[PDB]
Each structure stands twice: as C-alpha cells, then as structure tokens.
Amino acid sequence: GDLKWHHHNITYWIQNYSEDLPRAVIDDAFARAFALWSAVTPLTFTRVYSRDADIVIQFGVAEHGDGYPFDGKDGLLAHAFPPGPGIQGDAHFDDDELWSLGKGVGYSLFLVAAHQFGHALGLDHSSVPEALMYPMYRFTEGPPLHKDDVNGIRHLYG
Ligand SMILES: COc1ccc(-c2ccc(Sc3ccccc3[C@H](CCC(=O)O)C(=O)O)cc2)cc1
Ligand SMILES: [Ca+2]
Ligand SMILES: [Ca+2]
Ligand SMILES: [Ca+2]
Ligand SMILES: [Zn+2]
Ligand SMILES: [Zn+2]
C-alpha cells in the first residue's frame, strides 16, 4: 500500500461483530484503541456506517475473503493492511480467538486492535519488547504506548 494516509480525518466501519462480547463493549474497545493513536497524531477517527470507510473492520475465521487465512485458536490473532484504497487500511480479527478484556481468559480486543490500527496507519514492528508494535502479543493493564511507538507514528504524521 502507501506509507501513510494522505488525509487526516480517517473513517472506520465495523462491518460485523463477534458474539464473544456485547456490541457496545466491542465498539468501545475499538474507540479506545483509536483514541490511543489520535491523541498523539493530527489524525481523527470517525465511525461511519458505510462501505466508503477508510478502515473496514471485520471478524472472521480461516479463509475469510482476502487470501490471507487465519489459523484457528491462538497464533495469528488479527491482521491489518497498510494505508491505501480498497482493502488497504482494513483490519480483521480472528474470531477463532476468544475476545475479552484480556485480564482473565482470552485476548484483549483493545490491545490487539491498538496494534492492528498501528499497522493500518503504516507502522511496522518495533524492536522494543515493551512497545505496542512489538511482534509478540502481551497483556498489560498499563499504558500501551512506548516512546518508540510514538516516534514511529510521529515520523509518519508529525
Ligand atoms: C501491549 O503490547 C502488545 C504488543 C503486541 C501485540 C500484538 C501482536 C501481534 C498481534 S497479531 C499477530 C500475531 C502473531 C503473528 C502475526 C500477527 C499479525 C501479522 C499477520 C501477518 O503479517 O500475516 C500482526 O503482527 O499484526 C496482535 C497484537 C499486542 C500488545
Ligand atoms: Ca480500506
Ligand atoms: Ca488465530
Ligand atoms: Ca470468538
Ligand atoms: Zn483478512
Ligand atoms: Zn503486528
């Protein structure tokens, strides 16, 4: 795709849901993950109910329509495409995971979404183990962003 979005007013569409959590809980988890990135960039994130959205969000299993199949429980948790038109920018979550707040059983939808949205904005992986963009999932209740995450996003967006 591209290295960055060329506009600042990003839109997102939650195309479908997992039944693992109430819709309002899923909506809020995504809103909080977006707010992590909007706080540190000139970007804004606005929810729309439209196929025209920049970031289309889906939950799916196995081969789910893009040629990059999920793998069942664990392993690949989600993936996202770098910015651009069409499928670019979109973020997909493997519903063979149990989505939760992450503290007890399951994976944190908030933390996975925050990492995926980083990719959807153009970030690659960090080499800082504590960073949100490190390649390995990690549960935390503390602040997810490391200096390296902010440095990476500011490098793209100012
Ligand atoms: C607090 O700190 C955190 C740090 C990292 C994470 C975290 C990491 C990884 C994933 S998902 C994943 C898992 C295993 C292999 C590949 C992927 C896809 C790559 C898919 C592909 O390239 O085909 C990817 O890295 O996005 C989600 C969340 C969360 C919190
Ligand atoms: Ca898109
Ligand atoms: Ca999986
Ligand atoms: Ca599930
Ligand atoms: Zn996909
Ligand atoms: Zn990643």
The secondary structure of 27-67 as a DSSP string is HHHHHHHHHHHHTTSS-EEEE-SSTT-SEEEEEE-SS-SSS
Q: Burial level of 136, CB count in 10 A (0-12/13-18/19+)?
A: exposed
Residue 144 · residue 132 · CB < 8 Å: yes
Q: Ligand 1: which of 73, 136, 145 to mutate, most ligand atoms within 8 Å of CB?
A: 136
Q: Which residue, among 120, 95, 90, has the nearest Cα to 109 in the 3D structure?
A: 95
Residue 110 · residue 76 · CB < 8 Å: no
- Ligand 2 mean position, distance from CA 105 (Å): 31
The domains of the chain, with CATH numbers, are 1-158 (3.40.390.10)
Handedness of CA 51, 57, 60, 66 (dihedral sign): positive
Q: How far is CA 56 from CA 74, 121, 134, 138, in A?
A: 23, 13, 23, 25
User: For residues 84 and 121, what is the distance between their CA atoms, to the nearest angstrom?
Assistant: 10
What method did the depositors use to determine the structure? X-ray
- Residue 53 CB neighbour total at 10 angstroms: 19
Write out the residues surrounding ion ligand 2, Cβ under 5 A. Answer: 89-90
